[PDB]
Structure 1
């Protein structure tokens, strides 16, 4: 029941400078979430896959425009803010919250996140999904997406 999702998360910090690409492992976490949605026929926008995991980077101007456009187009925004913080994902969190996009933020359990990320709870249309592994995310994500989509339009601060 979800037409499209934008999936965000750390990119630069995950690129191995020796290889110019994200590891198999980091690619796998994003790929699990991408396939989770795509298997239901949902369109998934994701820069990491788009840019061949770091091998075919866009220019900063192109990356920025395309990401904003894809977030605007998508029904829901799902993202890992990152530990340490992903600068681009944090910009994206600002774009999405500022435009009233339904959001699911994937936060590592027992890690500290920014005041301006956790403070979005109850003030933007956001659900926080704390996780201790990728399987937990896969198990809980559909419920969280459905809830924030169900709230789209409810007034928020």
Structure 2
């Protein structure tokens, strides 16, 4: 495959309905669709949401931190939704990735406000910002952003 591996990040705990103990199937659908987008080409995807049963089976904080950091480091590209409101864990990961010089694509909801230390990464780290209004738009544009950051 052109892309050997990706780490896919995004809000996790805040998407977990504490009445159900998992993420809704609509939220799971966004991630599983992007995962399939990559796996269908033989690209390895690392992703905590799928890894931890969509919220049913959280790892310990030490374990989550270790695996997330290791897999971001191993992956060729880091692709993440910073989240609205902001995902604390994903923002730590954005720090790890940008501080490491990891190629990254940030998926930002169109017309939503994101942190200065997220949007300010554009053309200062190896990052591309992809603004979107639906899942289909992400699916249709993501490979371009990925290829551009990988090429740098």
> Aligning the two structures, in what range does the TM-score lie when normalised by the shorter sequence?
over 0.9
> When the two structures are superposed, what TM-score results if normalisation uses the length of structure 1?
0.96
* SS class of match (1:57): coil
RMSD between superposed Cα atoms in Å:
0.3
How far apart are 1:19 and its partner, in Å? Answer: 1.1
* Structure-2-length-normalised TM-score: 0.99
- The count of residues paired between Structure 1 and Structure 2 equals 151
- The structural deviation recorded for 1:63 is 0.3
Secondary structure, counterpart of 1:107 in structure 2: strand
3-state SS of 1:40 partner: coil
- Aligned residue for 1:41, secondary structure, equals coil
Question: 1:79 deviation in Å?
Answer: 0.1
- Once residues 11 and 68 of structure 2 are traced to their aligned partners in structure 1, the CA distance between those partners, rounded to angstroms, is 14
* Structure 1 stretches of at least 4 aligned residues deviating more than 3 Å after TM superposition: none
- Unaligned stretches of 5+ in structure 2? none
Who is 1:105 aligned against?
A: 106
Give the structure 2 partner of residue 34 of structure 1. Answer: 35
In structure 1, runs of 5+ residues without a counterpart are 152-157
Deviations 1:22-70 (A, max 9, x none): 0000000001100000000000000000000011110000000000000
Deviations 1:74-130 (Å, cap 9, x if unpaired)? 000000000000000000000000000000000000000000000000100000000
Distance in structure 2 (CA, Å) of the matches to 1:17 and 1:11: 12
